[PDB]
Amino acid sequence: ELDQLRQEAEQLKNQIRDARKACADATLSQITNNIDPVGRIQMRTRRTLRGHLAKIYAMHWGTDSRLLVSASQDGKLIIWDSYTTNKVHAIPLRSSWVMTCAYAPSGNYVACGGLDNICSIYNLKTREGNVRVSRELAGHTGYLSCCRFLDDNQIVTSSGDTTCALWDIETGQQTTTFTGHTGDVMSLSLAPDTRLFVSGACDASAKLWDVREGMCRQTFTGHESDINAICFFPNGNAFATGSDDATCRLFDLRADQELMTYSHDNIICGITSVSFSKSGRLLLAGYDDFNCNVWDALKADRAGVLAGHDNRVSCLGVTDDGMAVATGSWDSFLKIWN
Amino acid sequence: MTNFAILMAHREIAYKDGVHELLLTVITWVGIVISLVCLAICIFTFCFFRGLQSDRNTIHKNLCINLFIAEFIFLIGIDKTKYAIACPIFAGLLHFFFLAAFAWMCLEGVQLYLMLVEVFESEYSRKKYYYVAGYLFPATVVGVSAAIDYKSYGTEKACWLHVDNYFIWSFIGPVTFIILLNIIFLVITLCKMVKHSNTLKPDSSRLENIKSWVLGAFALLCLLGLTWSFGLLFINEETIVMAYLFTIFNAFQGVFIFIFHCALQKKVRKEYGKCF
Amino acid sequence: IAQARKLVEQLKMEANIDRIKVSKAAADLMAYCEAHAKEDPLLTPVPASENPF
Amino acid sequence: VSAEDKAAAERSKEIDKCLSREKTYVKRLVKILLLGADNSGKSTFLKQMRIKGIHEYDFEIKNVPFKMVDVGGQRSERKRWFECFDSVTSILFLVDSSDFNRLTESLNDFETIVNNRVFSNVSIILFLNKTDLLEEKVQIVSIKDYFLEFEGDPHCLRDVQKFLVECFRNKRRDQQQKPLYHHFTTAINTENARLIFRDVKDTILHDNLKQLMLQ
Ligand SMILES: CC(C)CCC[C@@H](C)[C@H]1CC[C@H]2[C@@H]3CC=C4C[C@@H](O)CC[C@]4(C)[C@H]3CC[C@]12C
């Protein structure tokens, strides 16, 4: 009888809730009460990157901290040089509906995806100097929402069919499939050690996955709406979430709980992107009210505002050395702050 | 001094003892100064912001630039008849720049036609054709006119063209043709507005629709330059009303252009707010 | 059914783990932030002589 | 040193030239989103035009580029992230006007699609197909057997056509937006492009007129 199984599930949920209530001895605010505030963070725009003909949906920084790639709805990928504001490559795409962009850690390949349900890998450093398609990863039954590189031969992707997959580029076949999400998966973040990753879907839940075994380790709840963005803490023992309820939250892996909420009464719009600082003290979130807010991750206080865009901010990322921040928006521009 | 009504005067007007000349010249000076200030503001507005760039912004900007230059030259060198070399040069510069302003005024109506009759856009770009027309029409007209008679570029009363030998028609005629074309274009535009205002919001109070139409017509009259027809009817002291209407509606043209295309538009105001 | 049994199995797997105190986690986060504070160019502005932008 | 800078500047200039060349073509392209069901007759309508996930069709009418986007299977998405089609000019809706059982489902789908915040700057074109099948049905089968809130004779094709038009029109709450166009086609008519052309031209003409009235 399924009733006994439902009772077992309810009993396990109650046991988990009791354990979590037992573990909660003090809040993060009380502990970080006497820490001096960061102050006022005033950032100015240093570079403006123009040339896209439509709304910009995704971007990714390079490991060398100089080159970045952006995706637009005109059906083109552009690779820029931030230092000199120069276009290195322009890659026409077969499908005009692009929602994701990724940059390889070694800088040899670039991934792309969208409504075509395919992920394509482009070889930048090829013979004769003509960027060409190297692979087309097919096997998903929904639109591709995110994709991250592990190395030159492994890529993890998420789709709207409530599944995530691990691919072998040289073969083109899924090595592992991560199932268990109810809603469509929207975000994806890789741990610094590249042995775990966290995912967020439209079921207001987040899950911790093991890349090796291929199972779900923990499930985090608390949001009241869909989750759009997710990011990992610099050390790797915590992660932050961004939802449509105009709130951001911080979860701890070891305590299996929530630690702080980042919300204000004057903010009613949902979060589209989230990112962290090199040391972790600053949390950056992008909103669709044409604005971006900087938070104090330890005291949950606003510290600054990045108001330069005249349309919705869709993408956001912080460079590896922590020197600059690049934001993309629906106005077809990229601005670099410092 | 001299008033603004000498530009459109195919006859030598005799003035009876009175206050008409002084009032007309005072109105000319005040209107041209305030129009120069407003035109400078409009030029900065149209050239600075990159979110306002289009195929009509270029026409607006070139019209404002030409009007500014022409009115500055008018205020500087229209009473310099005591200089035997400067005066013809001043007259020629005034001729060229006023003709350029009128060419861009005609391009405004051509843009209206290209917007309302042929709805879709073109495969090529029309900017080069705009720049060719609006700067090659005045050059050709002034060059041909100076080739025939070049001693007619100075008058004993003002630095303008001669009247006795029909040399003023080299400026008057093209303006009349442009005005007729703009009248045709405005009639077509108003007919389209009336016909297609019964499709969108088909049923509404007749008063508000008339208010919208008259406001649109007022906005378009500053760019079409149809208020230059008053000067054609100023022939003697009996029709002194035409001179007043000409100098009142035309010396304040920059003010109207500013009011209608920089302060009652939401895009310009939101750009200025962005600068705040 | 199979789906309910699988859900029960996953819940049992997630219900038996070693959880640490919240205060310990907060202290660890603060310690990391204080230890890596000097290497954050966004937290501490740097002179323009060393700024690539 | 200098050679690398010159080469990089030249490459950036060539890329900018290519983008500038394609901008003009991008500016003058018309995108229309195609919606409907299996019984509507989208396949026959597309096949008989005579000039995966997402399918796109390209055609030219009177030297004007057109593009039709057919979502198809992915239309089942009910998340706001799927509404990236806010740059389209119009939406082409196909329904079957010969089956009264599916009419209420079609009306619900039309209401859901039209009354969306993202579809505020787009016009709607409604095609009512299978008029020939409807003509033989309005006599043998009475429309009053399914909609008991209508007035008029049921054996008149014109009356039931007006009834269906009013039913589809009354579900739109955005009455101060781009207008709604309706037609009675048969999915094989050779004049199905010279209607979309006129509707799109009318929509763009109302867009141009709205900028002249300072509204
Ligand atoms: C851009 C163009 C239109 C401006 C050039 C001026 C044109 C219109 C020409 C036409 C007639 C010309 C004038 C005709 C006669 C004389 C008298 C002579 O002793 C000196 C030159 C002078 C004073 C000429 C100056 C230039 C002039 C005014």
Ligand SMILES: CC(C)CCC[C@@H](C)[C@H]1CC[C@H]2[C@@H]3CC=C4C[C@@H](O)CC[C@]4(C)[C@H]3CC[C@]12C
């Ligand atoms: C591109 C140009 C040619 C278009 C037409 C311009 C017209 C308005 C110009 C061009 C040349 C001009 C003529 C040039 C010289 C003279 C001789 C003079 O005794 C009377 C005016 C008269 C006869 C001008 C009349 C106006 C005129 C015909």
